[PDB]
Amino acid sequence: GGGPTSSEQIMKTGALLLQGFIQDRAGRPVPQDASTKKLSESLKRIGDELDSNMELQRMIAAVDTDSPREVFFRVAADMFSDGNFNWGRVVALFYFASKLVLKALSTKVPELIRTIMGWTLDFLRERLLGWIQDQGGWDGLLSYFGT
Amino acid sequence: GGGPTSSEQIMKTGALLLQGFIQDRAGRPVPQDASTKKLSESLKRIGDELDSNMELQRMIAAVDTDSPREVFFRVAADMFSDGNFNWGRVVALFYFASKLVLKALSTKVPELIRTIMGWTLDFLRERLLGWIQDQGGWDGLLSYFGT
Amino acid sequence: SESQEDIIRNIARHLAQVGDSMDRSIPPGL
Amino acid sequence: SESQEDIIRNIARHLAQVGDSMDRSIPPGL
């Protein structure tokens, strides 16, 4: 039963805060206690402020994220390379983690659309093509819609 | 150089229509010609109508999609098992494909949040934990925010 | 499970039915 | 590439700077 200074409480509360923070921005709910809720509120509004920092957004938009773990560790090391610490940097790091999540999804989306189109077009070719040809192709669907 | 009835035009136009349709719903732009644009418009509004069919939404929400390819082929076979064809079924199949895309992303999101939290908390533990302890843990961040 | 197989079959039947009844409108739809 | 390494370094520097200047407000922020 350690207090706030214990590493166990630090890792526990850290996970909670981070998850709440990331999930919040990804929704665009994680059960937490009152003081943790107060911190989550401050975090949320700072993330909002950073979302409006337009130079930062363009920078993050441009970094290529096919090896996102390399990117995360390189940015994290660089942010703290001068041997200084403050809470603003920790907040900033959390913000960066949430941006990586969103960046990662965005690279998944086209591949997912491609894979599923693959299934659908394969089914269409082997099972529907004959009937579609009898309609005179997709122009038959124009007729159907009354165009 | 085949017309609308050729299988080549059918597969080409089919991919275009499907991609436009899925991307449209995923955004929530794919270059196409005028008649293909007319079809895309009708498709879009039907998808809208199906999005409001609430029983269908609950049904699709409930199907488990960890093996989404099995699901797609089983639904597709079942939809056409009676040996009948019409354009409404083809539209409906396209709609289902777009719902699979969205369903697939939704199962990716938590795993992605987990992996990235993993990196961040690992970095925090090895590099920031000592300094955070000197602040008296996360309560130090409450102080920082002026709470 | 067998409970998922019922849901899948349900989805297919509803989608086929939706498709079949799109004929009943001009322009087609629900 | 070396052009990506510049962007990454840029991101890190901007984030460190943002963090360092959050001190200058009550409540902290931009």
UniProtKB/Swiss-Prot annotation, chains A, B:
Residue ranges of the motif BH1: 78-98
Family: Belongs to the Bcl-2 family.
Domain remark from Swiss-Prot or TrEMBL: Intact BH3 motif is required by BIK, BID, BAK, BAD and BAX for their pro-apoptotic activity and for their interaction with anti-apoptotic members of the Bcl-2 family.
Modified how: Ubiquitinated in the absence of XRCC6/Ku70. Ubiquitination promotes protein degradation.
Subunit composition and interactions: Homodimer. Forms higher oligomers under stress conditions. Forms heterooligomers with BAK. Interacts with BCL2L11. Interaction with BCL2L11 promotes BAX oligomerization and association with mitochondrial membranes, with subsequent release of cytochrome c. Forms heterodimers with BCL2, BCL2L1 isoform Bcl-X(L), BCL2L2, MCL1 and A1. Interacts with SH3GLB1. Interacts with humanin; forms fibers with humanin which results in BAX conformational changes and sequestering of BAX into the fibers, preventing BAX activation. Interacts with SFN and YWHAZ; the interaction occurs in the cytoplasm. (Microbial infection) Interacts with adenovirus E1B 19K protein; this interaction blocks BAX oligomerization.
GO molecular function, one term: channel activity
Span of the entire protein shown here: 10 to 167 of 192
Consequence recorded when altering G2E: In a plasmacytoma cell line
Source organism (scientific name): Homo sapiens (Human)
Cross-link (Glycyl lysine isopeptide (Lys-Gly) (interchain with G-Cter in ubiquitin)): K108
Sorted UniProt keywords: Acetylation, Apoptosis, Cytoplasm, Host-virus interaction, Isopeptide bond, Membrane, Mitochondrion, Mitochondrion outer membrane, Nucleus, Transmembrane, Transmembrane helix, Tumor suppressor, Ubl conjugation
One of the protein's GO biological processes: positive regulation of developmental pigmentation
Protein task: Plays a role in the mitochondrial apoptotic process. Under normal conditions, BAX is largely cytosolic via constant retrotranslocation from mitochondria to the cytosol mediated by BCL2L1/Bcl-xL, which avoids accumulation of toxic BAX levels at the mitochondrial outer membrane (MOM). Under stress conditions, undergoes a conformation change that causes translocation to the mitochondrion membrane, leading to the release of cytochrome c that then triggers apoptosis. Promotes activation of CASP3, and thereby apoptosis.
UniProt motif (BH3) ranges: 39-53
Listed name of the protein: Apoptosis regulator BAX
Curated annotation (Swiss-Prot), chains C, D:
Cell compartments where the protein resides: Mitochondrion membrane
Post-translational modification Phosphoserine, affected residues: S3
Motif BH3: where in chain: 11-25
Residue numbers marked as site, Cleavage: R24, S25
Protein name: BH3-interacting domain death agonist p13
Source organism of this protein record: Homo sapiens
Gene: BID
Parent-protein residues present: 76 to 105 of 195
